[PDB]
Amino acid sequence: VDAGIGVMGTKLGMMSFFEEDGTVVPVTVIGFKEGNIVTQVKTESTDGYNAVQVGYERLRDRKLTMPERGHLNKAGVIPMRHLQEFRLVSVDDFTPSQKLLFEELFKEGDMVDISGTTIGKGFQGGIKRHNFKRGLMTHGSKSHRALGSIGAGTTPGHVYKGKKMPGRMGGTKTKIRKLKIMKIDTDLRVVMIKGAVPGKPGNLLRLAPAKI
Amino acid sequence: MKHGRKIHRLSRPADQRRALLRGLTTQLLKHGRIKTTRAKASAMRKYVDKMITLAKEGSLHKRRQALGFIYEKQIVHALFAEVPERYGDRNGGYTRIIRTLPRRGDNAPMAYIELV
Amino acid sequence: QRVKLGDIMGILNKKAVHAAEELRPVPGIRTGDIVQIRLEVPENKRRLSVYKGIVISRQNAGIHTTIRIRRIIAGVGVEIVFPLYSPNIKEIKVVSHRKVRKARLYYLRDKLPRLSTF
Amino acid sequence: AVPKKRTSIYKKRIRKNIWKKKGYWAALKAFSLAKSLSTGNSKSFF
Amino acid sequence: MIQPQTHLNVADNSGARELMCIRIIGASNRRYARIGDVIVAVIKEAIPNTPLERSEVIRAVVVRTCKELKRDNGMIIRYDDNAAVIIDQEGNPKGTRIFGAIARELRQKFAKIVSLAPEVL
RNA sequence: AAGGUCACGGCGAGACGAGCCGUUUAUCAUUACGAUAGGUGUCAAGUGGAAGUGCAGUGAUGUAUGCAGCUGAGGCAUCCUAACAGACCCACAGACUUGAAC
RNA sequence: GACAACUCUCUCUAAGGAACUCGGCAAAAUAGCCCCGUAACUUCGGGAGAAGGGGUGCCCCCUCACAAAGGGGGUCGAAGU
RNA sequence: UUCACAUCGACGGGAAGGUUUGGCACCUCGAUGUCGGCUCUUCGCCACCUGGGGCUGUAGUAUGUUCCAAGGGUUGGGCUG
RNA sequence: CAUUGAGAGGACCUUUCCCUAGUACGAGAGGACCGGGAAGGACGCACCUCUGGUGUACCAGUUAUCGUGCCCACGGUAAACGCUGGGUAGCCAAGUGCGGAGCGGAUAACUGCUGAAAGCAUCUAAGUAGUAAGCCCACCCCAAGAUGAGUGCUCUCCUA
């Protein structure tokens, strides 16, 4: 349950905003490829919960299959790629018919949370996944960087599940929390936000207000 | 991880890879059409586009860098007398990567380089 | 009247440098110059701090086009970084020029300090 | 490292048939390439 | 970055020359001592006309460092040596004349070091 | 059939499978989509003054051309090259039984 | 082909410098020729290349045992066995 | 200072645990590789700290002892294998 | 495609300094509980805007030598850079941001409120209140192979 509808935007590099007091803050720059049109609302009557379903990245019709574009043309909106809802408490007033919601709702709310696919690092070891220590690099040692002991002795007879092994590190989404908003641009369709979003410039990014 | 490392390294070390690039683009400029593997094909594509457009502006500095890159002496001087008369107005894209059957003994994906 | 692409690094950075140039003019600091920095720090009431020194590098990334500066204070070896587009500076003055054959004077840190006193 | 016992006919016919089914998957690709190698304007196979 | 086996020069005329600093107080990191962190120094060598001899545990203040110093104004200050001031726990040192320049953020906790300093940058 | 898979051009994804983004009269015009990768043209950016010539010097070398010359893993533009040619899987109201109204 | 973990053979590493460790193990550092200078001790043979410090590339000139070599000067590089 | 039970508690008594040294020799010697260190767990509470409380010979700070509570933490070093 | 979430993981940690206030208390000396703020430490999730390490894409200086006929200028080699000087994009931290919230639920120890079995009493036998870093929920992610296999929207089943 979220405390309100959010938007989604793409990361476009990082820079530094110079505050007129004299400080230098590192900000991430957020663009918006297409407006976050509310496509499908799911209320308490026809569904077990209440959520507002928006989308993103208007595309060519060849890029989008028949169930997708049939679902989007059921709402009478543009064919678009990305599609996510926000679960919201039952006080909502949202029509699914082409609500091109403008981005003014976050500037006075100087706290926002963001979610995104972090950059994947592939099958990485235990020295960087779970912040282990390496063995002795010298003094006749042989267990350089290795995983060390894995379990206890005879009495378990196995290893505990969830034990810290090497595996695929990045690729899942994360949410970093309470990130204070900064100078929006009402003509450059760009929002400064002081922090570090998950991922390189180009990826999708959930931008939804806080849950404290 | 290889995020954004756009060098195309082969199954050979660095200086041997440089010699493979120079020799195979040299004999590519000698015969025109050539049989490579596909990694060697794209690795020829970047450098031989650099060597067609290098002696496109036939000065002395371009001719000396171009003679420094290519092995054979008499093929650089057969190049700038040929590339403005042929590959003017093309503005990039000097090759073609026509693929063929894999190689007997390796199942190596084998390609074939033109000049067009 | 044109909509803009995903090339917003250059136009946010370009209009940021153009706004900071509209506020105060700045002549360019090449590597090897001997310059002055006049800094605004509150509550000191002198409002013009003295920073003489030799620019070592210029790590120019748009709005962080910066100065690696060096002056031997009477103890030893002070190496200060300056953002040229910050509102905390007041003016720059290119006093001299060493005419050095290098873009990065990181050798000059640990040399003999008679060749580093501004 | 040294195997404690041996495998059955069961598990071995499973693993060998996964190996040969992995050989099955790389010939409908060869049927597609052999079918595109036939009469048609394709910019490959000089 | 001041490890617990570093040599710091003296920034005053208290009576020492350098010191092996031992195991910082305050910030419990103790493998990264930035500015303003007091250190439990021991005297490696000293001036032999002063009641500060060899092998004497004392408390001092890191006032210069080769590691950088991130400021909010955009500047980054760094020195070429490491320096400490032989300090007492009630503020002021027992050496008056401070050698070398210091920064100005440590004025908010150590004002006597700034007031006795030749340059405050 | 809808939708996938192979192939194809790759990736900020990745041991292999995966995943993701393309797969072309690859806009036309009044204002967000139909540039995937390489090349090319420019712009950030790195090293930092290239060759050749002239001048000064007995010569090492310095100087003008000339923030020039190379690099261009990054941004934008450009269809010049390769995205051609295909192939294959999945089809044909979704068993049997009760209740409701039509 | 690809450019995962991890082993091995190498290169570099901000700040510190043995805090690691059974133990400076291993790596890093010194390194060639000339000049200055060199202690405790001793079987007076040595230690000793003790330690420690300076020059070193390339172009000029002259002194020239008229082959090695010397001094003075300039020239570049961050760095000259 | 009075005062067995704020706190220790002599002379004695009753238990729990299986973490020391022991007793037996019950599995294992056609092989269950001891002590310390590195790496990496996880668990117990007989609680060192953190959270709540009682009593205090607790004026306050700091305590002494004790109840609930094992979520989390429990340093860097000189000596020695 | 879009999610609910049964179940499971991670995170729920901790210290000084300041106001209250040199106030209660104490002859003085000393010096609060409670409620806020600020700076840290470890841990974790990210990122490369700054500062760097590396960066065998790179460019620059130079030694020995072999080629390019020769001077210039280049190329090869001195392992898997000849040795150095810097560096874009990646990766990383020492760097940069963020997190650890809850007059939410029930409790353990305890303090209670009425209050009887013994017309006195007693936290309890009926009912009930404050309250723990502990339990659960909320917090971030995976998640219907949850065979109990969910829910919602949309596309397609044609010819003989």
UniProtKB/Swiss-Prot annotation, chain A:
It is found in: Plastid, Chloroplast. GO terms for biological process: translation. Keywords: Chloroplast, Plastid, Ribonucleoprotein, Ribosomal protein, RNA-binding, rRNA-binding, Transit peptide. GO terms for cellular component: chloroplast envelope; ribonucleoprotein complex; ribosome. One of its GO terms (molecular function) is rRNA binding. Residues 143-171 are annotated as: Disordered. Belongs to the universal ribosomal protein uL3 family. Component of the chloroplast ribosome (chloro-ribosome), a dedicated translation machinery responsible for the synthesis of chloroplast genome-encoded proteins, including proteins of the transcription and translation machinery and components of the photosynthetic apparatus. Component of the chloroplast large ribosomal subunit (LSU). Mature 70S chloroplast ribosomes of higher plants consist of a small (30S) and a large (50S) subunit. The 30S small subunit contains 1 molecule of ribosomal RNA (16S rRNA) and 24 different proteins. The 50S large subunit contains 3 rRNA molecules (23S, 5S and 4.5S rRNA) and 33 different proteins. This is Large ribosomal subunit protein uL3c. The lineage of its organism: Eukaryota, Viridiplantae, Streptophyta, Embryophyta, Tracheophyta. The gene is RPL3. The chain holds residues 86 to 297 of 305 of the full protein.
Swiss-Prot record, chain B:
Belongs to the bacterial ribosomal protein bL17 family. Keywords: Chloroplast, Plastid, Ribonucleoprotein, Ribosomal protein, RNA-binding, rRNA-binding, Transit peptide. It holds the Pfam family Ribosomal_L17. It is found in: Plastid, Chloroplast. Component of the chloroplast ribosome (chloro-ribosome), a dedicated translation machinery responsible for the synthesis of chloroplast genome-encoded proteins, including proteins of the transcription and translation machinery and components of the photosynthetic apparatus. GO terms for molecular function: rRNA binding; structural constituent of ribosome. GO terms for biological process: translation. This is Large ribosomal subunit protein bL17c. Transmembrane segments: none annotated. The gene is RPL17. One of its GO terms (cellular component) is cytosolic large ribosomal subunit. The lineage of its organism: Eukaryota, Viridiplantae, Streptophyta, Embryophyta, Tracheophyta. InterPro entries: Ribosomal_bL17, Ribosomal_bL17_sf. Component of the chloroplast large ribosomal subunit (LSU). Mature 70S chloroplast ribosomes of higher plants consist of a small (30S) and a large (50S) subunit. The 30S small subunit contains 1 molecule of ribosomal RNA (16S rRNA) and 24 different proteins. The 50S large subunit contains 3 rRNA molecules (23S, 5S and 4.5S rRNA) and 33 different proteins. HAMAP family: Ribosomal_bL17. Its main location: plastid.
Curated annotation (Swiss-Prot), chain D:
It is found in: Plastid, Chloroplast. Belongs to the bacterial ribosomal protein bL32 family. Component of the chloroplast ribosome (chloro-ribosome), a dedicated translation machinery responsible for the synthesis of chloroplast genome-encoded proteins, including proteins of the transcription and translation machinery and components of the photosynthetic apparatus. GO terms for biological process: translation. GO terms for cellular component: chloroplast; large ribosomal subunit. Its main location: plastid. It comes from Spinacia oleracea (Spinach). This is Large ribosomal subunit protein bL32c. The chain holds residues 2 to 47 of 57 of the full protein. Keywords: Chloroplast, Plastid, Ribonucleoprotein, Ribosomal protein. Component of the chloroplast large ribosomal subunit (LSU). Mature 70S chloroplast ribosomes of higher plants consist of a small (30S) and a large (50S) subunit. The 30S small subunit contains 1 molecule of ribosomal RNA (16S rRNA) and 24 different proteins. The 50S large subunit contains 3 rRNA molecules (23S, 5S and 4.5S rRNA) and 33 different proteins. One of its GO terms (molecular function) is structural constituent of ribosome.
UniProtKB/Swiss-Prot annotation, chain E:
Transmembrane segments: none annotated. Keywords: Chloroplast, Plastid, Ribonucleoprotein, Ribosomal protein, RNA-binding, rRNA-binding. GO terms for cellular component: chloroplast; cytosolic large ribosomal subunit. CDD domains: Ribosomal_uL14 (cd00337). It comes from the Eukaryota. GO terms for molecular function: large ribosomal subunit rRNA binding; structural constituent of ribosome. It is found in: Plastid, Chloroplast. The keyword RNA-binding applies. It comes from Spinacia oleracea. This is Large ribosomal subunit protein uL14c. Component of the chloroplast ribosome (chloro-ribosome), a dedicated translation machinery responsible for the synthesis of chloroplast genome-encoded proteins, including proteins of the transcription and translation machinery and components of the photosynthetic apparatus. It holds the Pfam family Ribosomal_L14. NCBIfam families: rplN_bact. Component of the chloroplast large ribosomal subunit (LSU). Mature 70S chloroplast ribosomes of higher plants consist of a small (30S) and a large (50S) subunit. The 30S small subunit contains 1 molecule of ribosomal RNA (16S rRNA) and 24 different proteins. The 50S large subunit contains 3 rRNA molecules (23S, 5S and 4.5S rRNA) and 33 different proteins. SUPFAM superfamilies: Ribosomal protein L14. GO terms for biological process: translation. Belongs to the universal ribosomal protein uL14 family.
